[PDB]
């Protein structure tokens, strides 16, 4: 796409209508006759599938247009079918309207009173007056039937007139999801009862029952075959009689064209051959394999010639007529089946060649492979390698990519300083140009050019145009991707939106791999063991804006799944923090100054003072020392903006107050006025943890300052680790002789665990021998049952886990030969840089019990777990209790069990991503258009309102983190007050009215809540329902206001209460979700991506495949169903301990329940949707295309799926408004 080629016309909408035979014969450039694609000598046979007049073919000027192979769009021809045959798309429609009729009266077998009743009901649904029609039914000898029909017609016409005169529905109908739902229900009942008439009502004479054995053939019984022309004539007559009644069954918007619907649409009078351009032969060196579509058309042409010859033979004129009639009938049937094969490749009789429907049905079809997910240009892929010195908002482009990828920059009067030298450089001397796109659109190339001529061309970049018509445009240079540009980096699979960010590009000089900073590891869920990822290079300024501002790596700090952070340094920097900010960390003047300048180099803008400031030494005498705390403090002081105070923060870390000595207070972290006065930086402070120092810097100084802080913290911790190492060893894993003796003595108490547990489960005496045949017999009876063994697998597992815990507690962290922080293993495990307590337990104490789907190790039919163990070995050792540790090694049986467990884990890990992605795809296809409107109400693309207030408060979860952290807000009150600057946020905002009403409703509520919820008459709306939170200050939710009031009523403490509540309410006014947010997409990702980690099948029982929602809906109604949906879709997430924001569960439940029923997220729910292209692009493209074209559905191109298919801008976010320019002159 070129920005200098403007397009005026835009596709408003498209409508699915059947093409008619008469229309085809007028457009066609030629009709094709012979079933030979091309004769010998290489030329195409005139009149064949190829031709000069069906599009220029392989260096043959097209006859139809007169232009070459490139400049001929292709032209459409047609095949004159000798006889009309069934259209396999509409065979079920033709076979429902073939039955349900009287072949003599040529009406339906239903009484015309009912037929007219349904006609007027469907005409009322054409205009959206759904309830008016339900009263139309409330109207209750033959000459009075005409009066009844006239009364209903007058009623319908007058209701239509009132609705149109009331400004309620325009001339083009009112079609939406609900009216569509009722129309579908009405038509389905119409057809279900229309076949219920076995005997006609207009003239009560029976008719034969048409019986279809399979597609291409229909049989009558009193068996007998019926020609297709008979069916066409029969339904032609029926449609002629009932045109007024089918005019409202095959339409949804008012047929302003008033064109009669025939039965000719249901039959294939002509086949249409696409231009030759779309059936070009498969060329593979010498091999030429013609198209399967060409072969199918050749077959149909052969059948046409054969049946035409049989007809002619019959025309040139007993027994000879008998054989020729049998052969003519078989020619009819064969050409019918061949047409059915050319359209669909599964109805045929005869592996089979793909049909035109088969190019669309499933994945790899034209929808889910060339429309939804295309293959993009100006992009690259590679393998990622880590690289500090990359600013956490940058990506390191190799020189290969940096020379290949280009951007078209139009030359101005201000750019010829650098684009001229880019042209002088050439396509290889980075930075430089590879092409010059002139005023005339000609793409002058530079790849094969000399440097002398290149400079000569550069000297004419910014010349005036000597063309009267191109004076508007100017030349473009395709410059190499410079250091200022932006790149959309994505790593498949894209489980969430934050996995496709926008980075600023740094052109590294050396190697061919995308070099990326460590912080984004959790954001992409990436490693560096060969992970591959792709960089997309946008080509226009409007695209640069979104990755630079909306998807920019700075804008992505908090994941909307819970508002938590998913940035922060990962492994080395965390342990470097546990060490650098210790009490033992003292730094001389030279060391401290080098560490400070090693990361806050003020030659590009790392620090906000343009001259580094230092801090007074902590220890003056004997010589000037410092501390790592002071290092953090001066780093913060340098990076933080001036004319603003420092942070105040109180928090904790994961390292207790016992791992630092008696009376220590390092576990609690304290920042006071921008200085680190206590506590060690940890995973909790910087890392994937909420409310830490980096999170607080994000919330107070902005996201950009947090990004700069992350870069400087990474650089500092790296420069500190490259001057001081940190290593794990073999001594770290060891235990003292005390620890080993404790471990052995406790594990000796695991000798009789198994026998006692087994005797307990079978309910015998605890003091019974292992060889007692009664115990053996009872264990044997337990063996075959899968639940008696289930409780034999559960009690023993608990005992061995408890003994595991006893060993771990008594051994570590006491017995370990090397203690924290000397023990680098514990240092990196407690801190959170890697691993858990369970890992160091297995490494130092024991692996424990091996779990294979909740139970113990699978058993043989004999009663032996393994060949090494006796039948029903009454010992926890045989069950899967791995006492050995990865330090001392494990026995062969325990090795076998560990292999079992590891293989099981690998199997499930392979399953989880693939199994749980279908659910996310379902959700994302449904909720693709559910966004935030400008009423702060969330609704679909069409407009069917889903909720009125986002979550009930319209608070963005990416800005909800520090809204209820009142103590934090008060401590940093001055910094927040500076950041919001209410000086220019009051000249256009009302305060008094919203505050008054909030006070009034607060007082009214405190007057109430003695009684349960049903008796609580409102008399007073919540402020958000009445007042716009983004326009009236103080319009805040009930629970938030109540918690703020409780805080102000328990904490009576230069800041007053009124100014603090003013600041908090302004912060709430700025913590509202902006209009145009794809809340459906965000909800789908936030419910599907965390689901990767009861469980997923439970989700499938609630989202996809319909306590129980059905019972609570059938008894308590729709809102109880919504509450049950949210509760059950939450507590499964809770049991996995994933924080899931209820602004997602509420949106999901309110989209499911939008019809008052339990609409799951499968094709059944999707059927009730206004836009056709979404449903076609989802699945069952054939059924949805039939339903779209039989109703002449004119979808208005609002869904995200549809607007791509038709080439228009989306309806979420940046496209959710227009932009118009003011011009000075009149």
């Amino acid at each position: 796409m070129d920005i200098s080629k403007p397009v005026g016309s835009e596709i408003t909408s498209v409508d699915f209508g059947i093409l008619t035979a008469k229309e085809i014969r007028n457009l066609s450039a030629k009709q094709i006759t012979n079933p030979t694609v091309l004769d010998n000598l290489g030329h195409p046979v005139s009149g064949g599938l190829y031709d000069l007049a069906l599009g220029a073919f392989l260096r043959n000027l097209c006859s139809t247009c007169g232009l070459d192979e490139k400049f001929c769009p292709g032209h459409q021809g047609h095949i004159e079918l000798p006889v009309p045959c069934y259209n396999p798309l509409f065979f079920n429609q033709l076979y429902i309207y073939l039955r349900a009729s009287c072949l003599f009266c040529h009406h339906f077998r239903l009484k015309s009173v009912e037929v007219h009743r349904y006609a007027c009901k469907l005409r009322l649904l054409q205009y959206g007056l759904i309830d008016e029609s339900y009263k139309l039914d409330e109207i209750t000898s033959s000459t009075l039937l005409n009066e009844l029909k006239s009364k209903r017609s007058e009623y319908v016409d007058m209701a239509i007139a009132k609705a149109l005169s009331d400004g309620r529905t325009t001339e083009r109908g009112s079609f939406t999801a609900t009216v569509n739902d009722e129309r579908k229900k009405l038509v389905h009942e119409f057809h279900k009862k229309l076949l219920s008439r076995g005997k006609c009502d207009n003239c009560g004479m029976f008719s034969p029952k048409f019986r279809k054995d399979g597609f291409t053939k229909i049989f009558e019984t009193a068996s007998t075959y019926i020609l297709s022309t008979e069916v066409k004539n029969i339904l032609d007559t029926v449609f002629r009689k009932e045109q007024c009644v089918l005019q409202y069954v095959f339409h949804s918007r008012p047929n302003l064209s008033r064109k009669l619907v025939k039965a000719d649409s249901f039959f294939m009078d002509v086949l249409v051959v696409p231009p030759t351009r779309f059936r070009l032969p498969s060329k593979l060196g010498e091999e030429v394999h013609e198209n399967s579509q060409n072969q199918l058309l050749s077959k149909v042409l052969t059948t046409s010639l054969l049946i035409r010859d049989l007809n002619d033979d019959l025309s040139k004129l007993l027994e000879d007529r008998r054989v020729i009639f049998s052969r003519l009938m078989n020619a009819f049937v064969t050409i019918q089946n061949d047409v059915n094969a050319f359209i669909d490749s599964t109805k045929a009789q005869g592996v089979p060649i793909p049909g035109v429907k088969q190019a669309l049905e499933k994945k790899e079809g034209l929808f889910r492979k060339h429309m939804m997910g295309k293959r993009v240009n100006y992009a690259a892929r590679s393998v990622i390698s880590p690289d500090p010195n990359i600013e956490t908002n940058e990506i390191g482009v190799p020189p290969v990519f940096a020379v290949k990828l280009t951007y078209p920059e139009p030359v101005t009067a201000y750019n010829i300083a650098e684009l001229r030298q880019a042209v002088i450089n050439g396509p290889d001397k980075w930075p430089g140009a590879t092409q010059i796109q002139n005023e005339d659109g000609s793409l002058v190339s530079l790849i094969g050019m000399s440097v002398e001529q290149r400079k000569a061309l550069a000297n004419q970049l910014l010349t005036p145009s000597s063309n009267v018509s191109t004076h508007t445009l100017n030349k473009k240079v395709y410059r190499h991707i410079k250091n200022r540009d932006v790149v959309l980096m994505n790593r498949q699979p894209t489980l969430h939106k934050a996995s496709m960010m926008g980075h600023k590009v740094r052109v590294l000089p050396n190697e061919k791999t995308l070099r990326l900073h460590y912080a984004n590891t959790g954001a992409y869920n990436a490693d560096f063991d060969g992970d591959e990822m792709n960089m997309h290079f946008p080509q226009n300024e409007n695209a640069r804006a979104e990755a630079l501002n909306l998807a920019n790596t700075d804008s992505q700090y908090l994941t909307p799944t819970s508002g938590s952070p998913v940035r922060g340094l990962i492994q080395d920097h965390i342990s470097a923090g546990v060490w650098l900010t210790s009490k033992d960390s003292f730094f001389t003047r030279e060391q401290y100054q080098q560490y400070i300048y090693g990361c806050i180099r003020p030659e590009d803008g790392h620090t906000t003072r343009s001259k580094i400031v230092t801090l007074p030494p902590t220890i003056f005498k004997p010589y000037p020392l410092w501390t790592g705390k002071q290092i953090i403090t001066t780093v913060l002081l340098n990076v933080t903006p001036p004319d603003m105070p420092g942070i105040n923060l109180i928090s904790k870390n994961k390292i207790k107050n016992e791992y630092w000595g008696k009376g220590s207070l390092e576990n609690e972290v304290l920042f006071k006025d921008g200085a680190l006065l206590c506590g060690i930086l940890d995973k909790s402070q910087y890392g994937a943890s909420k409310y830490g120092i980096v999170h607080s810097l994000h919330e107070v100084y902005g996201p950009e300052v947090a990004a700069k802080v992350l870069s400087v913290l990474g650089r500092l911790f790296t420069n500190y680790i490259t001057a001081t190492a940190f290593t794990c060893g073999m001594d770290d894993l060891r235990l003292t002789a005390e620890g080993n003796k404790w471990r052995t003595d406790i594990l000796k108490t695991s000798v009789d665990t198994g026998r006692e547990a087994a005797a307990e489960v079978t309910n015998l005496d605890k003091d019974t021998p292992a060889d007692d045949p009664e115990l053996l017999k009872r264990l044997q009876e337990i063996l075959r049952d899968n639940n008696k063994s289930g409780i034999l697998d559960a009690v023993t597992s608990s005992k061995v886990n408890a003994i595991t815990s006893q060993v771990v507690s008594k051994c570590v962290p006491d017995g370990t030969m090397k203690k924290f922080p000397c023990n680098s293993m514990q240092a990196m495990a407690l801190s959170g840089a890697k691993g858990s307590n369970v890992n160091v337990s297995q490494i130092m104490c024991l692996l424990g019990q091996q779990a294979l789907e909740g139970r113990r190790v699978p058993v043989m039919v004999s009663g032996k777990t393994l060949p090494s163990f006796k039948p029903y070995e009454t010992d926890a050792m045989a069950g899967g209790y791995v006492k050995g540790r990865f330090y001392s090694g494990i026995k062969p049986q325990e090795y076998y069990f560990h292999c079992m467990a590891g293989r099981e884990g690998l199997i499930d890990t392979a399953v989880k991503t693939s199994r749980s992605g279908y659910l996310q795809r379902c959700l994302t296809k449904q909720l693709e258009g559910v966004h935030v409107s400008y009423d702060n109400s969330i609704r679909d693309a069409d407009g069917t309102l889903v909720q009125f207030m986002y979550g009930g408060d319209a608070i963005d979860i990416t800005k909800e983190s520090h809204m209820t952290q009142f103590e934090f807000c008060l401590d940093n009150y001055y910094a927040l007050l500076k950041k919001y600057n209410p000086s220019a946020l009051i000249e256009h905002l009302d305060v008094e009215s919203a505050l008054k009403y909030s006070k009034k409703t607060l007082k009214y509520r405190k007057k109430h809540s003695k009684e349960p919820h049903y008796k609580q008459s409102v008399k007073y709306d919540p402020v958000l329902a009445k007042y716009n939170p983004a326009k009236y200050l103080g319009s805040v939710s009930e629970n938030f206001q109540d918690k703020l009031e409780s805080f102000l009523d328990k904490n009576s403490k230069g800041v007053n209460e009124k100014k603090f509540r003013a600041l908090m309410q302004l912060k709430y006014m700025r913590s509202l979700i902006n209009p145009g947010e794809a809340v459906g997409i965000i909800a789908s990702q936030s419910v599907g991506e965390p689901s990767t980690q009861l469980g997923i099948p439970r989700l499938r029982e609630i989202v996809m495949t319909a306590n129980d929602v059905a019972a609570v809906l059938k008894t308590y109604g729709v809102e109880a169903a919504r509450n049950t949906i949210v509760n059950e879709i939450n507590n499964v997430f809770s049991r996995y301990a994933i924080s899931v924001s209820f602004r997602h569960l509420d949106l999901i439940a309110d989209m499911m329940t939008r019809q008052g029923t339990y609409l799951a997220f499968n094709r059944q729910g999707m059927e009730t949707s206004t836009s056709s292209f979404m449903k076609m692009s989802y699945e069952t493209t054939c059924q949805f295309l039939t339903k779209a074209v039989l109703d002449n559905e004119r979808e208005q191109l609002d869904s995200p799926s549809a607007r791509i298919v038709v080439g228009k801008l989306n309806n979420v976010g940046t496209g959710s408004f227009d932009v118009l320019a003011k011009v000075p002159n009149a």
Partner: peptide, 18 residues
């Protein structure tokens, strides 16, 4: 030549000729 940059997309006559 004769593109959206240089030719009107749609040129109608407001009324009958005068």
């Amino acid at each position: 030549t004769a593109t959206t940059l240089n030719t009107p997309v749609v040129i109608h006559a407001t009324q009958l000729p005068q």
